[PDB]
Design a protein around this ligand. Structure first.
Ligand SMILES: Cc1ncc(COP(=O)(O)O)c(CN)c1O
Ligand SMILES: Cc1ncc(COP(=O)(O)O)c(CN)c1O
Lengths: 384, 384
């Protein structure tokens, strides 16, 4: 044989203990770790289907919707976003994009690649979107879909949602909202706020492992997707196939792909946990924790990047990089000396911020103390 | 709130004990179950990268290649196939497809959706491809890529590979081979047999959980992908991004998507296991087990669908449905009475066969006895 057994693979796997307090992913509670260690069942068994049904009721609970076209995407954040755009937007269609952070910029890049006409409302890191600025774009471009980042995890901004669905619907437009970094950590009502496509990721405030995502489509969305001239560029993400398998339509579930069974075990449990807590409890926890953290960081003499407290994402706090420090020094000092993961910026916010993450079980005063103690020592030990 | 906590989510998760002896997925050994229950690390940490490096050496070992453009796809089988086709085939390009089973038919459907000219060499269930039939197509259509199903898990056929790479290369063509149902269970040498794109799935003979896949690209493939006029229709599967992150190129690893960390733990271990066994041992085990099973099924008076024993896939055995039975009766009887999953057909083979799966740790005489005992009782108890 050409290749011989890799010598590094012949030692036993060993992973460190890290406290993950960056934008994502998050640490796992015991129940979700327990689910990840279970044995396999038939990917198309009665028992697997029952689990998928329970997961759907769960996504309906956290999204606050009754859309029967609700299901899990076998992929990360990007994969739910991509599934949204490749099933909704045909080549030529007009797409209006709130590019307030990396997430809008990505939604742009996808849009361009599948041949949409892409209308970028660039706002500098920290900025948000006013209903009028939306209708001024809506008037200028007459799009079929508006993408809005709810929890902008690259800028620590909480986008206001109220009204925008009723605005978009007047102009015949569809509302797509990125709630990957917001779901479970701030108020969100899909049906009530008139959202057409809502997606979220497992690895954020739900505390499940990365590589699944949540998506729900309103009836209006469903129509646009179920009366395309062409087929979507993706077969893996084709909604008509996915919808069928997950049991959304009238036809019996036909084999599309193989779903990530053990991940669905974990995701199920993550949804059972926030079910047991209750949504408004979870929003309380994250709102208070966030409040505490900004207090402590303010004491250290650090500055919160988002100045208006009504626009600060509870789940991901941006902190202006203190003048005269190498951000990478701080970030490295923290993990090295305290085994805590924090991040720098991302996209427009690259170099400008530090990012701190409070997500689900991880959103405790304990962890805020820890990250504040760690940032203390770093600030007085990193060169100036 | 609109929706209240689902009452089914408020009971504790419980899953049955099934022996999975269908085409896929397979049961997990203890080490892979142990890995799935571990705690999370930073998705972009030094430690996560070291694991990804070890997984790459592993895919190089089982694929038998030194292609430095080798990596995991964050998706199932279809996702590796789709990633192959959307990065290699530009709209208009000529694509020659060995449609001997469902897998070719799917490769067709993808091909059509991304705007390739799709040349379907339909052969009836059980058939394979002769080097001449390939060069007669190669002469007729002058394709940029030929897709060949190695282990045709819908028909139980083992496609001969030897020569075809040297054939395709003469015509400037690229060879793409679907080794999802063959890797680890029959001889396969990527470099030596001159394969340009080879992919496989985790949930088959490697005994890892579904939702990752393995892919490797030769230099020739790399060139075609790294000199496209257009961008691929997919951002999630864009090879230039994936290659970078996984550490294949010269640039430092930039954030694309979040990789399924806990799955990569499991996949790593699945590769460490077949590393410890050794490839030719694993091929021995599956060849013998397969041999035993055909003996036992022959005794029950059942007929093997693939008549030439040199063309029978060791990992997935097709069995002609016995005259005068409802296949679904047998399949249902087996799971109900013996807790064993077997399958019927799929695509062209739908209704025509029963499928039995011997994959990795599951490919033992014990399990062949069990499935043979179970099929015994079914045959004498199902109506005629
Ligand atoms: C707001 C937001 N948008 C998009 C993503 C992308 O998720 P993934 O990298 O898992 O695809 C994330 C996850 N960090 C996110 O928080
Ligand atoms: C030969 C073959 N091709 C394709 C696939 C598709 O794999 P998945 O459903 O995990 O995408 C499989 C898995 N059963 C396979 O065995």
């Amino acid at each position: 044989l050409l290749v011989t057994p890799p010598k590094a693979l012949l030692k036993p796997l060993s992973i460190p203990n890290q406290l993950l307090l960056g934008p994502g992913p998050s640490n796992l509670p015991p129940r979700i770790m327990a689910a990840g260690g279970l044995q396999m069942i038939g990917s198309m068994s009665k028992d697997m289907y029952q689990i998928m049904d329970e997961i759907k009721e769960g996504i309906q609970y956290v999204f606050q919707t009754r859309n029967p076209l609700t299901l899990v995407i076998s992929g990360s954040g990007h994969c739910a976003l991509e599934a949204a755009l490749v099933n909704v937007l045909e080549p030529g269609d007009s797409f209006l994009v709130g590019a307030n952070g990396i997430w809008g910029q990505r939604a742009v890049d996808i849009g361009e690649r599948i041949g949409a006409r892409v209308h970028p409302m660039t706002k500098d890191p920290g900025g948000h979107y006013t209903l009028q600025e939306v209708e001024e774009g809506l008037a200028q471009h007459k799009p079929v879909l508006l993408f809005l980042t709810h929890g902008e995890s690259s800028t620590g901004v909480l986008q206001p949602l109220d009204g925008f669905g009723e605005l978009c619907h007047r102009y015949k437009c569809l509302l797509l909202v990125d709630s990957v970094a917001s779901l479970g950590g701030t108020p969100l009502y899909m049906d009530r706020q008139g959202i057409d496509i809502l997606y979220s990721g497992s690895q954020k405030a739900l505390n499940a492992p990365p590589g699944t995502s949540l998506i729900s489509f309103s009836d209006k969305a469903k129509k646009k997707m179920y009366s395309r001239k062409t087929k979507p560029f993706s077969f893996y993400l084709d909604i008509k196939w996915l919808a069928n398998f997950w049991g959304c339509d009238d036809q019996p579930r036909m084999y599309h792909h193989t779903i990530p069974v053990i991940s669905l075990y974990s995701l199920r449990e993550s949804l059972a946990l926030i079910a047991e807590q209750g949504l408004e409890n979870s929003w309380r926890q994250h709102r208070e924790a966030a409040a505490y953290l900004h207090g402590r960081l303010q004491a250290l003499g650090l500055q919160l990047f988002v100045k208006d407290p009504a626009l600060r994402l509870p789940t991901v706090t941006t902190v202006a990089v203190p003048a005269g420090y190498d951000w990478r020094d701080i970030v490295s000092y923290v993990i090295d000396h305290f085994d805590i993961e924090i991040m720098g910026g991302l996209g427009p916010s690259t170099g400008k911020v530090l990012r701190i993450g409070l997500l689900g079980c991880n959103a405790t005063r304990e962890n805020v103390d820890r990250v504040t103690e760690a940032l203390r020592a770093a600030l007085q030990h990193c060169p100036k």
